[PDB]
Amino acid sequence: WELTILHTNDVHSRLEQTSEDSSKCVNASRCMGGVARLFTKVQQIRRAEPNVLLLDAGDQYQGTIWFTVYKGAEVAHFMNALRYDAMALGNHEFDNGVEGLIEPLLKEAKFPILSANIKAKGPLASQISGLYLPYKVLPVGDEVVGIVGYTSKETPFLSNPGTNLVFEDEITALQPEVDKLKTLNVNKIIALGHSGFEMDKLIAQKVRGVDVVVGGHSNTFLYTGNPPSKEVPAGKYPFIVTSDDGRKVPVVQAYAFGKYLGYLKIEFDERGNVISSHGNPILLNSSIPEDPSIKADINKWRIKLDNYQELGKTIVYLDGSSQSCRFRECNMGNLICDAMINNNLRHTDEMFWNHVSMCILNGGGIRSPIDERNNGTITWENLAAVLPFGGTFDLVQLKGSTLKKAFEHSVHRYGQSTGEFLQVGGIHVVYDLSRKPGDRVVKLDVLCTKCRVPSYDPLKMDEVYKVILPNFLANGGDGFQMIKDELLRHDSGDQDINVVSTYISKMKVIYPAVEGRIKFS
Amino acid sequence: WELTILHTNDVHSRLEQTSEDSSKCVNASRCMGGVARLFTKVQQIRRAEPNVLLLDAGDQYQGTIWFTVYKGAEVAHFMNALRYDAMALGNHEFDNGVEGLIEPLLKEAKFPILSANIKAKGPLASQISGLYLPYKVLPVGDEVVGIVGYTSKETPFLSNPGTNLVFEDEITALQPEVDKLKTLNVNKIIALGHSGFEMDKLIAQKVRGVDVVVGGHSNTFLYTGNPPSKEVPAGKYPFIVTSDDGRKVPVVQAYAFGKYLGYLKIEFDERGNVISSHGNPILLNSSIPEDPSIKADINKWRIKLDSTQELGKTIVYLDGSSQSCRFRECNMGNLICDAMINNNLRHMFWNHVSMCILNGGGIRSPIDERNNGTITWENLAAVLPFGGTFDLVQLKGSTLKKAFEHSVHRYGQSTGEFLQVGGIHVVYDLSRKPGDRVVKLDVLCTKCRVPSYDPLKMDEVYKVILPNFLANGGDGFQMIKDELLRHDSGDQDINVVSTYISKMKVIYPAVEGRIKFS
Ligand SMILES: *[C@@H]1O[C@H](CO)[C@@H](O)[C@H](O)[C@H]1NC(C)=O
Ligand SMILES: *[C@@H]1O[C@H](CO)[C@@H](O)[C@H](O)[C@H]1NC(C)=O
Ligand SMILES: [Zn+2]
Ligand SMILES: [Zn+2]
Ligand SMILES: [Zn+2]
Ligand SMILES: [Zn+2]
């Protein structure tokens, strides 16, 4: 008995086809992904194979004006049109609160939405009862397949799920559900979830009875053979984990932004044991036509969006890709920090903040690049994809020791494409990744403020510094608990996207460089 | 027989009293220099000492809107009022060409103007004949003293003297003039000139018959004891040179910008041999009152000068002092280079240009931030007085590396070649041999979607924005003039910086590490 698992993750509101790097489509012959093209490929496979599941591992929410405007209604609509079979909740599904998850998505989805490790408490429990499930048993041909869901333990620090939801440890929360399925004589079991590649492998190894893990969150690209595009494989597809109970468990993920369709064929015996698995993500390039009906529907909904005028011009590529901004100095990060600093200084009235020259900004907050080849034009739509969260750029007062700890946290688990990696302004930092976590920062110089000419001086642990940063970080987002607990003063500031669009309008032509604000030894 | 030598050099249009750093006076209680205050001090000395000479060692011209508007007439007028006894020509005296010097300095000065190593060729010769002299014999009491003048032979690459003036070696041109004075039995000789401290010491050493050297050009502060202000002494005052004759020859200079009055007392014997000398520059601070009469004349002329509206605000000290910009990265240089780049980018072969060089010698004043941050046209005019343009050139890598070597080839003499930059990270090792001091030179890539710094390559070609002065080989940058591959003239220098300050509204250039030393 063969099962074909088709899988997406971290689509992040890329409803329309995109440029190769997931930014707006311009030359529609090199464009990729989009829901209309996805439909075609799914349809082709459904024509060919008898036992097909189409799964999503979370993070449909957030990423373009589609989501800014339709708030998830577009998600339920097009996922329904694609006839997804199940979805696990990702952290970004909680970005508009539970209220923004229940109403546009949980009420409208025609397929089960899953997470076994999220527990409701207080009044919310009976409100959201049954709207998402820990698992679902799905008929596939004459067989059934159990699908069990999970969501990153870190979600309260990543998104806005509120205080009435408890996020338990994935493995602990999963094992009883998998056991219940086994007592129900479900012998084929897929764990579908949004915790990242490292947790996916742990689940494969530790949760007895799981046959396949379909993951997301870390935007992991896996591939067997020579890759068809710019993404560099982190490992083979599928990635085989040897479980503690001695089984070979395939672990898959499919990058992000709808660029690829995950495709894994599993051979089971009649008792539900995996005999073999093989596949590869399918590049959704222009060789696959966009489905006319879906496309027409897309064009219909695209009308309301067209509103989003030219803000200014860039003469350089604005690299706001996660592969850059979560790993090293990226010019989009520099631009945003420079904008934060610039906008604030143009408030010369407020005396306590009018020399602030230091900025930090989590790479996880930077959600898209902007391409320069379209006459360099930058529009509100382009920018809303970079900064979709509607946050503010705030001022805080911090001890040197706090900042040093923040920079340690920035790389404490480097290599997993997590969001806490810091972009900067008025700061020169050097990391040595070979040293133990907590001790990786080997140089940290900052612009002096009590000096008539700004220059770089070593940060002192017992001095106090003034820093501009996203409110998300001021509130301890991405696990910067030291900032929230230790800050000395916190004033709220201007709206993030307005700050950057203003700066671009003032500057007229921008050209941020990679300058060596951040180095590695 | 005791002679009192009072001396100024490199006043550079500081006619009005100034802030301590030579920029515009704001809080008059803490201000310094200016001709009114100088007059008071000179007068206190003349009234107390029998044998006084007041000498200037050049570079009166250029530095504030006084010179922009009056073009030298203010120099002749106020030097006449102070009754200078002699002046040597400096390089900046040629900024407005020979016509800018003949009229109105040489025609209107009531004192001799000197330079023995400047020779006029062709038709200019008869036109300039006698308007400046190689030497002058001055009666002082019952005695005479000879003064011989000299002017940096680098003047053609620093200023605009034209093709009809020849600038000979100072030492070779001085010796026969000094010999002529000996023939006339003048036994007390002062060399007064504008070539810098190093040349002044060479003159003291090798020109037989010179008793005292009074210099300028390098803005050298010399002092004996604890200095009265921020300037750090480069040596004792006077600086003693041992000549090739075995004689001790005092060498003096008095910083710049009219901040100090040089004061040297010298004891001569009957045969015009220096027995001893002592003194010190006198700090012209607020303990010395401005002469009411000179002040009133200054206040009268000042009317035609009233700048004006605020261009924008700075929240940082804009360090355009020579002690910074000719020695290390200074934030005024960063500001000007970033403005050069910014203006060009928003206003096509050059539309990606990200590299800038600017000689520190073109940066003529700082701007103080403590005046409610305000920046006026007057402030800016003091920083960029030359009316040049910011041009675009195309240069081989090898040329650029040569330029950066030249930049530090004689580091330490406060000369103008030292380069401020944009889009470039340079590292110097000053312990290495001249011509091999550049140990790291990274520049912003051009053929790239995202700008980053990469090592400069000799064989590659770069586009750079820089002053027309450098494109033309000013400051000895011959390699740029001779080797460049394309040169397009650009916008007016002060206009570029003004509009940038205006567009940015609030500025805050930092010292970032664009230039480092090993
Ligand atoms: C689509 O992907 C396949 C596999 O890499 C490739 O052979 C084909 O050329 C691609 N189509 C286009 C239009 O590039
Ligand atoms: C002026 O300078 C001298 C030291 O050179 C000092 O004694 C005097 O106090 C100064 N005057 C003022 C007003 O500071
Ligand atoms: Zn995601
Ligand atoms: Zn996620
Ligand atoms: Zn000078
Ligand atoms: Zn000079």
Swiss-Prot record, chain A:
Keywords in alphabetical order: Cell membrane, Disease variant, Disulfide bond, Glycoprotein, GPI-anchor, Hydrolase, Lipoprotein, Membrane, Metal-binding, Nucleotide-binding, Signal, Zinc
GO process terms (BP): adenosine biosynthetic process; ADP catabolic process; AMP catabolic process; ATP metabolic process; calcium ion homeostasis; DNA metabolic process; inhibition of non-skeletal tissue mineralization; leukocyte cell-cell adhesion
List of residues binding Zn(2+) 2: 10, 59, 91, 194, 217
Membrane topology of this protein: Lipid-anchor; GPI-anchor
Record-listed IMP binding positions: 326, 362, 367, 389, 472, 478
Annotated effect of mutating residue 330 to Y: In CALJA; absence from the plasma-membrane; exhibits no catalytic AMPase activity
Lipid-conjugated positions (GPI-anchor amidated serine): 521
S-S bonds: 25-31, 325-330, 337-359, 448-451
Glycosylation sites: 27, 285, 307, 375
Activity-regulation annotation: Inhibited by adenosine 5'-(alpha,beta-methylene)-diphosphate (AMPCP).
Compartments, record wording: Cell membrane
UniProt-annotated binding residues for Zn(2+) 1: 10, 12, 59
Chief site of localization: membrane
Residues annotated to bind AMP: 326, 362, 367, 389, 472, 478
Recorded GO MF terms: 5'-deoxynucleotidase activity; 5'-nucleotidase activity; GMP 5'-nucleotidase activity; identical protein binding; IMP 5'-nucleotidase activity; nucleotide binding; thymidylate 5'-phosphatase activity; zinc ion binding
EC number(s) recorded for this UniProt protein: 3.1.3.35, 3.1.3.5, 3.1.3.89, 3.1.3.91
Subunit and interaction comment: Homodimer.
Family (UniProt): Belongs to the 5'-nucleotidase family.
Function: Catalyzes the hydrolysis of nucleotide monophosphates, releasing inorganic phosphate and the corresponding nucleoside, with AMP being the preferred substrate. Shows a preference for ribonucleotide monophosphates over their equivalent deoxyribose forms. Other substrates include IMP, UMP, GMP, CMP, dAMP, dCMP, dTMP, NAD and NMN.
Listed name of the protein: 5'-nucleotidase
Organism annotation: Homo sapiens
Name of encoding gene: NT5E
